[PDB]
Nucleic acid binder design. Structure first.
Ligand code: NA
Ligand code: NA
Ligand code: NA
Ligand code: NA
Lengths: 124, 122, 126, 125
DNA sequence: TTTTTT
DNA sequence: TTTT
DNA sequence: TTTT
DNA sequence: TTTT
């Protein structure tokens, strides 16, 4: 979502969009994608949809990553921008580059949540 | 309830007339100035501390004012580079809103020749 | 077309795309457009078509502009990149921003050609 | 005779392994190296003097090698900013070719997830 | 020291 | 963090 | 480890 | 007679 004007860069994380065979949303390399929570997903309450900029679903975040990010999105600790760098025509999974922005005071809370699930932000 | 609509690029202008400074990769705020004596569509660009940096170009403001005034989208601005430019400053804008308003936003932009795209902040 | 590896920025120029009502090609603001000479044009031997990046014709360069640029394009004195900054959905005319690239050995000939037609190059971005 | 197909953005990588320097807004040359023992698709990036600066990222080279080898497009590279970076450098690529080859270029790019767009070398000021 | 703020 |  |  |  839109970040506050005092939002700053927290760091980056690499992950994957999965479930591609079940959706038809098209994305190309170097394009933004949207991360969108789907708490009513009957298979995973932590589900995060990945949509293209026109609104069409591309796939889901891998459930292990969703299990970490769900808390961060739900409590608005950071806004997360997704970009597909390569592999946008892949049949089953594609890489995702995620950039985290947020208020300085929320920086530690984000990093701590990621560490809990075995993730860590990389450099700017 | 807000979803990603896409992005636009533009420039902040009139820098020499204001004292607000910006760092590279910093957010900026867009703020309407409807009583501007030269352009009712004016959109100010302010830095994180609230000091004015400049204005959107009149052609861009001409497209966006309707969108802001009718709350059809929230527009996030960031200056990705060229923050120390003398006359104009690059601006990246990301648009967010309700799906019910996606068409109205694209229609308004289209009147002015703009089309939201998929370019990220970085 | 593609420039030589030793090509440098010459400068910039603002102009206009015309004849929009006669073509169905679509362009949006901040998009590149292609400048394509059309010497076989039965109305103007200096004609320069403007196409979108998919190759669909959008219109033509204004004739007074074409009259200055045709020589530069034909003699390959510079490569010209066009961008439509605003007005891409206008009914009849839209503005065009042009940047000029070329070898330093030709920079003078370009400026003298433009100045011959009352045009001049401005600064290119830093 | 060649027409504009569009542009792509990417990065020059492996800078720290080469000595070639680029300045901002300088053109660079793309040169295939089919004998590279790490990657037959390798595309060198050389500066104006012919000195190697780095390589195209392997995923991008994987898409472009076919296009270069079959002369489906001419690719013009410019470094729009970050020319002084130590590790990786932004690259803007403009594609030109014969109209009859436009679909082949787009098909080859699409197989690798790439799509040419309308972004110029510069948006001006 | 532009496309020269809005 | 940071080739091919 | 074949989406979530 | 407001594209070239
Ligand atoms: Na799919
Ligand atoms: Na100022
Ligand atoms: Na038209
Ligand atoms: Na180096």
């Amino acid at each position: 979502g839109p970040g506050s004007v005092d939002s700053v860069l927290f760091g980056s994380l690499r992950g994957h969009v999965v479930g591609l065979r079940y959706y038809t949303g098209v994305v190309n390399n170097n394009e933004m994608v949207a991360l969108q929570r789907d708490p009513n997903n009957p298979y995973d309450k932590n589900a995060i949809k990945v949509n293209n900029v026109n609104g069409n679903q591309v796939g889901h975040l891998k459930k292990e990553l969703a299990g970490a990010l769900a808390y961060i999105m739900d409590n608005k600790l950071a806004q997360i921008e997704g970009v597909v760098p390569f592999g946008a025509n892949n049949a089953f999974t594609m890489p995702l580059h995620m950039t985290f922005w947020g208020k300085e005071e929320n920086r530690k809370a984000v990093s701590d949540q990621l560490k809990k699930h075995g993730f860590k932000l990389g450099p700017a």
